[PDB]
Structure formats: structure tokens, C-alpha cells
Amino acid sequence: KPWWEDEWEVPRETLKLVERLGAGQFGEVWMGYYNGHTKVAVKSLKQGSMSPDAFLAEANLMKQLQHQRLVRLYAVVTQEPIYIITEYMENGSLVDFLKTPSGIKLTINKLLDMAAQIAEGMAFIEERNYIHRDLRAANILVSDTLSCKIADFGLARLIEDNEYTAREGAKFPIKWTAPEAINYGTFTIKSDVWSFGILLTEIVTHGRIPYPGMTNPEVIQNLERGYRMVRPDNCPEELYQLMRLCWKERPEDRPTFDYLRSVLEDFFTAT
Ligand SMILES: O=C(CSc1n[nH]c(=O)n1-c1ccc(OCc2ccccc2)cc1)c1ccc(Cl)cc1
Numbered sequence: 001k002p003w004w005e006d007e008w009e010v011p012r013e014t015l016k017l018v019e020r021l022g023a024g025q026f027g028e029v030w031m032g033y034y035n036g037h038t039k040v041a042v043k044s045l046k047q048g049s050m051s052p053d054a055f056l057a058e059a060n061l062m063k064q065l066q067h068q069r070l071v072r073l074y075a076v077v078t079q080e081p082i083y084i085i086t087e088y089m090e091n092g093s094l095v096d097f098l099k100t101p102s103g104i105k106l107t108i109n110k111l112l113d114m115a116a117q118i119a120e121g122m123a124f125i126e127e128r129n130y131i132h133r134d135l136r137a138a139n140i141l142v143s144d145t146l147s148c149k150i151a152d153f154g155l156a157r158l159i160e161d162n163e164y165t166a167r168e169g170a171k172f173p174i175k176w177t178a179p180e181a182i183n184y185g186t187f188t189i190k191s192d193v194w195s196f197g198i199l200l201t202e203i204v205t206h207g208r209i210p211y212p213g214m215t216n217p218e219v220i221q222n223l224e225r226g227y228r229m230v231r232p233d234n235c236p237e238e239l240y241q242l243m244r245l246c247w248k249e250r251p252e253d254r255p256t257f258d259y260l261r262s263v264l265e266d267f268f269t270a271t
Contacts, residue, residue: 003078003079006076006078008059008063008073008074008075008076009075009076009077009078010034010075010076010077010085011077012077012079012083014034014035014075015032015033015034015040015042015077015083015085016032016033016036017030017031017032017042018030018031018032018033019031019032021041021092025046025049026045026046026049026050026055027043027044027045027046027049027055027081028043028044028046029041029042029043029044030042030043030044031088032085034074034075034085039088040074040075040085040086040087040088041074041085041086041087041088041089042083042084042085043083043084043085043086044081044082044083045080045081045082045083045084046081047080047081052080052082055082055084056076056078056082056084058084058153058154058156059073059076059084061130061153061156061157061158062086062153064128064158065124065125065128065130065153065156067121067124068149069117069118069120069121069124069148069149069150070121070124070125070149070150070151071086071087071089071141071149071150071151071152072086072087073085073086073087074086074087086151087149089141089142089143089149089151090142090143090144091141091142091143091144091146092141092142093137093138093139093140093141093142093151094114094137094138094140094141094142094148094202094203094207095136095137095138095140095202095207096207097142098137098202098203098206098207099206099207103206103207104206106146107271108204108236108271109268109271110146111203111204112239112264112267112268112271113268114142114146114148114203115199115200115203115239115264116261116264116265116267116268117147117148117149118140118148118150118196118199119196119257119260119261119264120261121148121149121150122135122150122192122196122257122260122261123256123257123258123260123261125150125156125189125192125257126189126192126256126257126258127258129158129159129160130156130157130158130159130189131156131157131159131164131187131188131189131191131192132150132153132155132156132192132195133155133156133157133164133172133181133187133191133192134152134154134155134156135150135176135192135195135196135199136173136176136195136198136199136202137199137202137203137207138152139151139152140199157187159188159189162188163186163187163188164186164187164188165184165185165186165187166181166185166187167185168185170185174216174219174220175198175209175210175211175216175219176195176198176199176210177191177194177195178190178191178193178194178195178251179194179220179223180251182220188251189257190251190252190254191251192257193246193251193254193255193256193257193260194246194247194251194254196246196257196260197242197243197244197245197246197247198210198229198246200239200242200243200246201229201232201235201243204232204234204235204236204239205232205233205235208232210229211229211230212230212232226249228243228244228247229243229247236267238267239267242260242263242264242267246260
């Protein structure tokens with residue numbers, strides 16, 4: 001729908017930007033209020049830095065992926081400077097939150113709870129025929145009640161035929177991305193499953209970088225030999241074997257996110 005019929009469009013006047021949370025090459029992220037009372041995150045596009053079409057594509061996708069476990073699109077302002085307004089997540093990114101004094105004190109039981117919550121959001125994405133492609137602890141946000149939601153849908157795509165193929169000059173973080181996506185640019189929900197295994201390491205290490213002490217070429221080399229990431233310190237062997245399932249050589253041998261969810265819920269209720 002055009003902006004004057006779009007239910008997400010709001011007049012810019014409804015928003016007050018209060019605190020800047022980040023600034024980057026492509027704009028800024030702010031904590032703000034809608035109509036005085038409702039706390040929201042506001043992402044603004046820096047004019048000229050990237051296409052306004054490209055920027056808004058993320059909001060359009062979010063219109064199609066609404067679930068409790070996914071950061072919700074709140075509103076858009078589609079006149080420059082373009083805003084994308086989203087659900088405010090009080091405890092920020094999981095990667096940062098696990099390092100705070102609150103995050104540090106979480107038990108393995110709660111970390112397994114959080115992993116299941118993330119699997120639950122990914123299972124919805126999977127059921128809807130989408131892929132995320134940027135699944136990592138930096139892209140999980142944490143609420144004031146210590147619940148987790150999937151965020152950052154910039155790379156997310158609707159799948160028609162199982163598989164999205166990026167351009168052959170496209171680069172993705174080596175440590176988090178499935179080998180077939182790095183090698184061939186071919187992404188499926190099974191690529192996100194591999195990333196989820198990497199994300200589990202970030203959960204259990206309180207946000208430490210995957211593949212301790214290795215460069216990207218070393219990671220690629222070890223993987224091709226059939227090694228997987230070394231058991232993280234203080235990782236329950238159960239969780240480590242679940243990570244390994246995520247890291248199966250053949251994408252189709254990797255489990256579904258529904259399976260991951262159900263297993264992690266069992267892990268959680270046991271602990
Ligand atoms: O990158 C971001 C911004 S994060 C972000 N987006 N949405 C949201 O709620 N946060 C968030 C919330 C609280 C927060 O504060 C915790 C904190 C305090 C001090 C120091 C460090 C953390 C930080 C981020 C983003 C990504 C996608 C989108 Cl759609 C919007 C923003």
C-alpha cells in the first residue's frame with residue numbers, strides 16, 4: 001500500500017528521539033517514545049549512504065513475519081530522513097547482555113531457556129518459508145523480563161524453492177556462516193541451523209568469539225578436515241552434541257528448528 005494507506009506509516013511528529021544507542025555508516029539507532037508514553041527503538045537512514053528502497057525492504061519483510069519471538073515492526077516514516085520504528089528491547093543484544101553483571105550470573109538452566117526461545121523464533125521463520133542469514137548472538141535482543149527475540153531482518157529472505165543464492169562477490173562472517181553459503185553463496189534454513197549451532201557457543205561462553213584462537217583460514221581448514229569447534233569451556237556435553245547436529249556436513253542432515261526447540265526445552269526442564 002502507498003504511504004497514505006499503509007497502517008504502519010505514522011507522522012514523524014508522533015515520535016520523540018531521546019537517547020542515541022548507536023551510529024554507523026548507514027544511520028543511527030535511538031531509544032524514543034511514540035505519542036509520549038510508548039518506548040520504541042528508532043532506526044534512521046543517513047541520506048545518501050544506501051538506497052532508501054534497500055533500507056525499507058527490511059520493514060516490508062517484517063510486515064510478513066510477526067510473532068512474539070520476533071522483534072515487531074512498530075511503524076515507519078517513509079519521508080527523508082526515513083525511520084524504521086521497532087519493538088524496544090530493554091536489555092539490548094544478547095552478546096552484550098550476557099557480559100553484564102546480570103548476564104554473568106545466569107545459570108545454565110536460564111541459558112538453555114534462552115536458547116530454546118531463540119529456536120522457537122527460528123522455528124516460526126522456518127515454518128513461514130523464510131531464512132534469516134545473519135543469525136548470531138548480536139542479532140538476538142533481550143527484554144526486560146529476560147525473554148529473547150530474533151532481530152535484524154536486513155538479510156532475511158522469503159524462500160520459494162528452498163534456496164537463495166547470493167552474488168558470487170558476496171561476503172559473510174566466516175565463523176557464523178554455513179560452509180555451503182560461504183563456498184557457493186547458497187543459503188537455506190539449514191544454513192541458519194548451522195549458524196544457530198555457532199550461536200549456542202556464544203550463549204554458553206557468555207558472548208565469546210567462536211573458534212577460540214583461530215583465524216578464518218584456520219577455521220575453514222579445520223572444518224574441511226572434519227573437525228568442528230573445540231568443546232567450549234563449561235559446555236554441557238548434551239549441548240555440545242546438539243551443536244554438532246547443527247554442524248553436520250550435509251545441510252539436509254541438520255535438524256529442524258522445531259526439533260532444536262523441543263530438545264532445548266527438555267534440556268531446560270531437566271535442569
Ligand atoms: O543495532 C541496533 C540497536 S540495538 C536495539 N534495537 N532495538 C532495541 O531495543 N535495541 C536495544 C535496546 C536497549 C539497549 O540498551 C542496553 C545497553 C545499554 C548500555 C550499553 C549497551 C547496551 C541497546 C539496544 C538495532 C538493530 C536493528 C534494528 Cl531494526 C534497530 C536497532
